């Protein structure tokens, strides 16, 4: 084996998932020909 | 016109969601991502773990494991790689494997089954390498299928079976340990110098049976080291463990007043620190859910074997430290055990271990995840977990025995052109 | 009785002497030692390097190289190892190779030939791996013999031929570089977006021809890393280089009054710092002696090609930086060169390099190690050194073209029982 | 594609050896090198001169 | 390549070799049954 043996339990309540992606933004990904809202 | 030859290093998002489900005691793939040589990998996973609704309330916690592994493409394709990378563009494409034609097959690899019934070879073979190096018992045979469509159901829909938590009967000595060894002598003489050399040959054999079934173990005993490239094994990057808890709900109508139902829900986090990727490969993330191995019909060894002798009861140091291992049966630790099933233990192990006690009033009662009958079959069948042993503990739902919803916060530092550079000619 | 299971860590001497000899431009093995997993290796080598007595005195120094490499046994035996180590005692013995029956054959491996004409396979195969990874030109074919008795004389008695120091004609571009590349178009049209994609395919091909002939080079360009286990290559531990000097002796009789003779003798040291041995293997030490590649008939390129054009003489930056490589012949740099032998150079390379000048009065004169005639044959024959080119420089002796006497101060920290423990039963 | 129109200024080695011979009272050429407009030239020559015994 | 690129020339004269072995002694190696000079 190598290197982990950590732990991960947290207290609280399981809040619902909010936003599929996004922790840190880079450059643009999509180009449609203008703004779209 | 303008021809681009290089790029700058920037972070890439690569974050997504996780609607997972599985069985108990089976190892299933949760997430997967390809990487390039020279990258840096980071991941935070935050989610909730739930079990199916219980029948009578919370009594015993379960333990959950999360692993992350790194598998180079050279460990899978071997010599077809390297030639592929040295030829560059216009090289022959890499091969695939066949799958059974359903939607839920190839779900132990964390993907939906394509309509062509073909998947990349490195996805299937990278799962086998992890299982054969870390999750099966070292004395078991390896698993070598070459095609996911050679597996059966419950191996394609859910993962491979894993091992119980260590115990008197779930962790016996390997079935190849010798209880005696002969030395050839003459009719009325013996060479006492050759007797000394016979003990040194037995010492090396016993080490290779208790500690050193793998090559990386043999080298470690000399004081050396092996890289995972020398052994061709995956690299473990992170491991997490926790216990799952919850609360109860009370019934309030005429019939269910006095009845309770347990709800397991746990918040967890799996964090991987920054990892330098040396070659092209894949990162795997896997999960495993287990219960402590409690059975309703287990007895203490001294209460089950018939008549107590001096060796059983005295606890004499000169006797336990100098005797060979003892062979017993399933009838000595279980009420309805089979006398023809044998396994070996160490002398005096009954003074080092204590089993759990379950009252006879608990026998055949819904809820309460126990093992109702002593396991049958050969040794390999007993050590691995049967998830049909927990069918009476949960209510029937479409989401199997546990389910999870998780967000993966990944971040990679690559050397790639922007989307703008890829679509503009000049 | 008493059975020993372990030992303590102590230093071991393992020091010996060195009476060596060899030819010029050939790589020969100087020392060899086996190691165990978990050891620590150290070495100081102190000695003197001599050439054969010269014919007229000292004019040009020579340069000498000392290398040390570490070769694991798993790189040689492969899968027959590992199985050998996992089985322990009572495993099948390792194979050997055959040699020609003489005393001086197998002398490039640093050993005397046994009377059985058989040597361990790891001695011969460990020499081939060093040569194929570090000493041949990357565009040459590998050498694969499987038996030392398939070599010829001068390969068995002395090492393999190595390459000249880099030069205009000893370091040309690889013989596979393309001077043009076509793109398919229509009759009266052309796709200008596909033209942009044709330049990107050519860029990857040119990189794989000038820098990246080996797999470890391709991975390095992405920014990654490969261990020597991934590539299955030897590990270089130390390298030393120096120039060899001496003095002259004057003749004092009636005929030799006014005559001088050169004597090369140099003191050197090869030091290897402490090295942790991770697996069983061998340490090699090798030597190589060379001269700068000076020839008596070499001319400047601009003085030899006929009529000077603007591209030859102007030194214009817009022209040298945008033209394909130029193909020339041996007649353009040598007086008696062959017009049918071609090689490729970079444009403007005549303004970056200056050759050495040897006066015509020096032609065909003993002493003075030069190359009297332009080399013949294909490209591989020219790049490698011919030691017959230095026969007229030395006087005939039994000790070849150079000889050395060296003491090796080795020290290893092992885990072994003492000699006393091995001979006493109790 | 990319077309280069200029360069930067860098030093170039252009060093070599000298095995020379001659007679007495005669002027002979020892070394020669081509140059381009705008260059800077420098030279150190170190050697030994011998006569016949 | 890896890690060396060192140098080794020394000035002086090549003194004759003195003693075949010996840089640092460990334990005894030979047992004849007594002292032998």
PDB file of C-alpha atoms in Angstrom, chain C residues 24 49-51 54 57-65 165 241-248 262-267 288-294 356 367-370 390 393-394 401-402, chain D residues 17 19 50, chain E residues 9-10:
ATOM      1  CA  UNK C  24      41.657   2.990 -28.793  1.00  0.00           C
ATOM      2  CA  UNK C  49      47.164   5.391 -17.160  1.00  0.00           C
ATOM      3  CA  UNK C  50      49.921   4.760 -19.702  1.00  0.00           C
ATOM      4  CA  UNK C  51      50.097   4.608 -23.471  1.00  0.00           C
ATOM      5  CA  UNK C  54      55.570   6.805 -28.846  1.00  0.00           C
ATOM      6  CA  UNK C  57      57.407  12.713 -28.666  1.00  0.00           C
ATOM      7  CA  UNK C  58      54.272  14.254 -27.234  1.00  0.00           C
ATOM      8  CA  UNK C  59      52.099  16.389 -29.497  1.00  0.00           C
ATOM      9  CA  UNK C  60      48.387  15.821 -28.731  1.00  0.00           C
ATOM     10  CA  UNK C  61      46.688  14.756 -25.517  1.00  0.00           C
ATOM     11  CA  UNK C  62      44.050  12.044 -25.322  1.00  0.00           C
ATOM     12  CA  UNK C  63      40.902  12.044 -23.199  1.00  0.00           C
ATOM     13  CA  UNK C  64      39.824   9.166 -20.938  1.00  0.00           C
ATOM     14  CA  UNK C  65      36.376   8.300 -19.547  1.00  0.00           C
ATOM     15  CA  UNK C 165      34.007  13.194 -30.854  1.00  0.00           C
ATOM     16  CA  UNK C 241      36.913  12.467 -17.431  1.00  0.00           C
ATOM     17  CA  UNK C 242      40.489  13.733 -17.769  1.00  0.00           C
ATOM     18  CA  UNK C 243      43.338  14.444 -20.197  1.00  0.00           C
ATOM     19  CA  UNK C 244      46.528  12.363 -20.231  1.00  0.00           C
ATOM     20  CA  UNK C 245      49.983  13.998 -20.209  1.00  0.00           C
ATOM     21  CA  UNK C 246      53.652  13.085 -19.737  1.00  0.00           C
ATOM     22  CA  UNK C 247      57.179  14.092 -20.803  1.00  0.00           C
ATOM     23  CA  UNK C 248      60.009  13.304 -23.250  1.00  0.00           C
ATOM     24  CA  UNK C 262      57.239  10.592 -25.562  1.00  0.00           C
ATOM     25  CA  UNK C 263      56.066   8.894 -22.379  1.00  0.00           C
ATOM     26  CA  UNK C 264      52.433   9.315 -21.329  1.00  0.00           C
ATOM     27  CA  UNK C 265      51.693   8.572 -17.677  1.00  0.00           C
ATOM     28  CA  UNK C 266      48.817  10.079 -15.708  1.00  0.00           C
ATOM     29  CA  UNK C 267      47.528   9.717 -12.146  1.00  0.00           C
ATOM     30  CA  UNK C 288      37.225   4.393 -22.986  1.00  0.00           C
ATOM     31  CA  UNK C 289      40.238   6.168 -24.545  1.00  0.00           C
ATOM     32  CA  UNK C 290      39.903   8.497 -27.548  1.00  0.00           C
ATOM     33  CA  UNK C 291      41.717  11.128 -29.636  1.00  0.00           C
ATOM     34  CA  UNK C 292      40.262  14.305 -31.182  1.00  0.00           C
ATOM     35  CA  UNK C 293      39.264  13.545 -34.798  1.00  0.00           C
ATOM     36  CA  UNK C 294      41.947  15.318 -36.831  1.00  0.00           C
ATOM     37  CA  UNK C 356      41.689  22.050 -37.931  1.00  0.00           C
ATOM     38  CA  UNK C 367      53.894   9.466 -34.634  1.00  0.00           C
ATOM     39  CA  UNK C 368      51.283  12.211 -34.734  1.00  0.00           C
ATOM     40  CA  UNK C 369      47.941  10.400 -34.370  1.00  0.00           C
ATOM     41  CA  UNK C 370      45.945  11.611 -37.378  1.00  0.00           C
ATOM     42  CA  UNK C 390      46.608   4.583 -34.876  1.00  0.00           C
ATOM     43  CA  UNK C 393      51.713   6.117 -33.902  1.00  0.00           C
ATOM     44  CA  UNK C 394      52.994   3.542 -31.374  1.00  0.00           C
ATOM     45  CA  UNK C 401      47.709   0.584 -27.236  1.00  0.00           C
ATOM     46  CA  UNK C 402      47.139   1.560 -23.581  1.00  0.00           C
TER      47      UNK C 402
ATOM     48  CA  UNK D  17      44.448  23.627 -34.187  1.00  0.00           C
ATOM     49  CA  UNK D  19      50.229  21.903 -37.399  1.00  0.00           C
ATOM     50  CA  UNK D  50      60.623  24.599 -33.024  1.00  0.00           C
TER      51      UNK D  50
ATOM     52  CA  UNK E   9      43.186  13.783 -12.969  1.00  0.00           C
ATOM     53  CA  UNK E  10      45.833  14.229 -10.264  1.00  0.00           C
TER      54      UNK E  10
END
